[PDB]
Amino acid sequence: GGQWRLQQGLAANPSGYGPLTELPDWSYADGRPAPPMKGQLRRKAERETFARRVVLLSQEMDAGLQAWQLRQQKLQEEQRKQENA
Amino acid sequence: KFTRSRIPEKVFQASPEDHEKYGGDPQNPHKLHIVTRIKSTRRRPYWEKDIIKMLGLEKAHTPQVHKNIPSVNAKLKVVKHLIRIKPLKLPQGLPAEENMSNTCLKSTGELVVQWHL
Amino acid sequence: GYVPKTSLSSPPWPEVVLPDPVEETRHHAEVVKKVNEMIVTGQYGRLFAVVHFASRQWKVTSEDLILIGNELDLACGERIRLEKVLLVGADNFTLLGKPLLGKDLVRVEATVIEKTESWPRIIMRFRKRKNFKKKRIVTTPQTVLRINSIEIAPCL
Amino acid sequence: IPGRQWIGKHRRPRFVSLRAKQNMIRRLEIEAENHYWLSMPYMTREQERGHAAVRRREAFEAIKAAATSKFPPHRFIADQLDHLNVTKKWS
Amino acid sequence: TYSPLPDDYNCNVELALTSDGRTIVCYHPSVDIPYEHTKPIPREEGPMIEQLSKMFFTTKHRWYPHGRYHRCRKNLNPPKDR
Amino acid sequence: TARGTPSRFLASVLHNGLGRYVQQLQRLSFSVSRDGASSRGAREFVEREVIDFARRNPGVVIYVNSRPCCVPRVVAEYLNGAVREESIHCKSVEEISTLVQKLADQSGLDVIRIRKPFHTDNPSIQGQWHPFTNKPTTFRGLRPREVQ
RNA sequence: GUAAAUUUAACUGUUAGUCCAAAGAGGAACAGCUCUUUGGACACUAGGAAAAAACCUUGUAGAGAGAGUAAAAAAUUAUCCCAAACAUAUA
């Protein structure tokens, strides 16, 4: 059952993102933790690249909106110095 | 003969009923798309294959983000029957550099920074 | 709002009704207090823990062995603890997480006894009429863990 | 039945199960949602024009540098003179 | 003794949640079998196969012997589980 | 293939994790040739790595023969009598180090198939299932359709 | 959105097939018949439709005694029939 999991905002596959896979799977006896799983490293890298791509697209299209605004304003202002005398 | 398809644009004039059905917001329209492939490229023509190789959608059920520019919409409008596109809502703003290696994505379509394992 | 009794007007399933929520909570508090005093005194005996170590679920008890199909980056005879315990049970009581159980209510130890590589397994692909005949030998690495103890603690 | 039983005038028509119809409806509702989320773009076409030109240009320049960069690898004296120790001894 | 499901066919088990909600505790004791439900102790090679067929209720096929090939492939010292 | 080869059940030597852990390998026996190409990768292992391997776990007695032969080999004698012979001819440094570490980090039991991934010696805490668990009892023990 | 395209030097090989949807021609608006075209698949993996190259779902490949899904269940009143059954326990 995984349609119910989605209508409750969970990963449909319990081996996806959740407590079961994110948390470390072991620890040394005294208590000092142990180097993470290579799956954890791989998924941290993939999520990092995803976030960076989101930043790139968002801020570049905003820069495009700003550039279009100033281009239209340049058209407006250099339309105004042709109306003297 | 079989050809490409030209969808009439009237299929994309969302109604107010649609707005209140899905998470509608006509004005202040959403910035990005998160797109996931849910069908095979095989048994489907070659230009669909090329598009699904252009939008980064090689593996199925692997989400990839894209702009909402009409160019990418004109690409998605011919592989729409192989993709599930959901808005990437950002309840709190896009992450900063220090807290970027500690972010994660929820199945409801939201990117969130507070992901302590 | 009335229907004469008939074989199909009513629902065949016997319509149960749930207990009153407040009395239900009081009952739940009483029984958890009972299990808590059982754990604090020492009633239990041996314990079995359903654990989620490193690929999949193992049902584990004291003294026993578990073969994992991958290396674990640990010297031989180097004590370890297994977090992610999703069931722990004794003769009379058993606790299930939702999904997991805190790192204080259940403590599962372990040791590594041997690191081996599995027996040589064969991958052969073959197709008829095409001279397609591929052969390969694979030796997965494995490590065997002795589960040492499973200590439950009163914190409920 | 004449032969090649799945064709011919007296073909056997397959039946439409309920779960196949339910699958059709699932895909079709997903399509309706796609139609919605393609029904409102951010930037009109006149606005996007050239906004990401710099990124594409630098990516293509990276491609060009990679293409132009192919050349034989170096050749060191150490390799040729370290093959000469397949006759080590003890004495 | 709560019986939404009639927990009397076998025994009774009590369910509860710890106060916060992140652990579920179930109490199941070994119900003992009552006394007054108890009772007191009360104080020739074809017919061979047929009689063994009726006593153990298996059919006749498995009782005939097997040849040498099917009895050198049998494992004399099999591994011991547990 | 599985049918065509032996098998076993998951096992330790002497319940080798309960009280403690004892290294299973007692002995390693290197044979090397002073003047011979095949032993080259082994020769340096006697110069560079063997000293640190000998100190890095001291329960193993390491012998090195240094005969005037042409072939090397390593004999790994274990506590329970099993001898693992391994060939190191025409090998190099890193692979011989990996081999000797692999020998000194496994038990002596044969590498043949493992049938169960576990060896739970007391596989029940709550009472193994027989067909009468979960089956009710009746008044005076009347099997069905009886009278008295 | 992409990371590929064009050109130079260099040889071999195939060079056209079958079936399905679609527009058509011939033929009986038959043929597992012949012939053009746009697409798909096959001659490569796997699961389904009973068996099933050609229909539907799926691609990049190993180990696992872990999980979620895809397609996917037949309804109306001329040797020897051919799945056994079942109108209702919360999809």
The protein footprint on chain G, as nucleotides within 7 A of a CB, is: 1-5, 20-23, 30-32, 37-45, 49, 51-52, 56-60, 62-75, 88-90
Determine the distance from the C-alpha atom of residue C91 to the mean position of all C-alpha atoms in its chain, rounded to a whole number: 16
Nearest residue to F54 via CA among F2, F104, F115: F104
Tell me if C78 sits within 8 A of C112, measured CB to CB: yes
Nearest residue to B73 via CA among B105, B30, B18: B30
Write down the domain spans for chain F: 1-148
CB contact under 8 A, C83 and A19: no
Q: Which of residues 4-33 of D touch strand G (CB under 7 A)?
A: 4-9, 14-15, 17-20, 23, 26-27
C42: left (phi over 0), alpha (psi -120 to 50) or beta: left
Q: Which of residues 43-82 of D touch strand G (CB under 7 A)?
A: 52, 55-56, 59-60, 63-64, 67
Determine the distance from the C-alpha atom of residue F20 to the mean position of all C-alpha atoms in its chain, rounded to a whole number: 17
In which domain, by residue range, is B78 found? 1-117
Q: Using the Cα atoms of residue A51, residue A53, residue A59 and residue A65 in order, give the sign of their dihedral.
A: negative
Could you give the CA distance from residue F52 to residue F45 in angstroms, rounded to a whole number? 10
Question: Chain A within 8 Å of B38 (Cβ-Cβ)?
Answer: no
Q: ∠ at Cα C110 (C35, C55), nearest 5°?
A: 90
A31: left (phi over 0), alpha (psi -120 to 50) or beta: left
CB contact under 8 A, F12 and C146: yes
Technique that determined the structure: cryo-EM
Q: Which two tokens stand for residue B115?
A: 């992901």
Provide the pairing of β-strand F113-114 with F7-8.
parallel
Tell me if C156 sits within 8 A of E25, measured CB to CB: yes
- For this entry, resolution in Å reads 3.1
- Please give the span between the terminal C-alpha atoms of chain A, in angstroms, as a whole number: 79
- What is the interface size between A and D, counted as CB pairs within 8 Å? 18
Q: Which of residues 17-46 of C touch strand G (CB under 7 A)?
A: none
Could you give the CA distance from residue C113 to residue B63 in angstroms, rounded to a whole number? 42
Q: ∠ at Cα A22 (A19, A26), nearest 5°?
A: 95
Tell me if A39 sits within 8 A of A21, measured CB to CB: yes
Total Cβ atoms within 10 A of residue C109: 16
Scanning every strand, the nucleotide with its C1' closest to C56's CA turns out to be G66
Q: Which of residues 38-57 of B touch strand G (CB under 7 A)?
A: 38-46, 53-56
Tell me if C156 sits within 8 A of E16, measured CB to CB: no
> Residues A41-55, buried b or exposed e (16+ Cβ, 10 A)?
eeebeebeebbeebe
Q: Which amino acid is at C94?
A: T
DSSP state of F22: -
What does the longest C-alpha to C-alpha distance in chain B come to? 56
Using CA atoms in the order F40, F42, F43, F48, what is the torsion angle rounded to 10 degrees?
130
What residue of B is the nearest CA neighbor of A23? B117
Sequence-ordered alpha helix ranges (H) in A8-37: 19-22
How many structural domains comprise chain B? 1
Nearest residue to C115 via CA among C81, C71, C146: C71
| Nucleic acid strand G within 7 Å of C138 CB | yes
C54: left (phi over 0), alpha (psi -120 to 50) or beta: left
Could you give the CA distance from residue C118 to residue B104 in angstroms, rounded to a whole number? 37
Q: What is the DSSP string of C46-91?
A: S-EEEE--BTB-EEEETT-EEEESS-----SS--EE---EEEEE-S
Q: What strands lie across the sheet with B83-87, from one edge to the other?
A: B64-67, B32-37, B83-87
Which residues lie below 8 Å from residue C126, measured CB to CB, with a gap of 6+? C132, C133, C134
Question: Chain B within 8 Å of D49 (Cβ-Cβ)?
Answer: no
Total Cβ atoms within 10 A of residue F62: 16
Which long-range CB contacts under 8 A does C29-33 form with residues at least 24 apart?
C29/E16, C29/E19, C31/E14, C31/E15, C31/E16, C31/E25, C31/E27, C32/C156, C32/E16, C32/E17, C32/E18, C32/E19, C32/E25
Q: Which two tokens stand for residue D56?
A: 């594409």
Q: Count the helices and strands in chain D (H runs, E runs).
A: 4, 0
Determine the distance from the C-alpha atom of residue F146 to the mean position of all C-alpha atoms in its chain, rounded to a whole number: 60
DSSP, collapsed to helix, strand or coil, labels residue C96 as strand
CB contact under 8 A, B95 and A6: no
Could you give the CA distance from residue B93 to residue B110 in angstroms, rounded to a whole number? 11
Nearest residue to C152 via CA among C98, C111, C91: C91
Nearest Cα of chain A lies from the Cα of D38 at a distance, in angstroms, of: 17
Nearest residue to C146 via CA among F104, F101, F19, F7: F19
Q: Which amino acid is at E24?
A: I
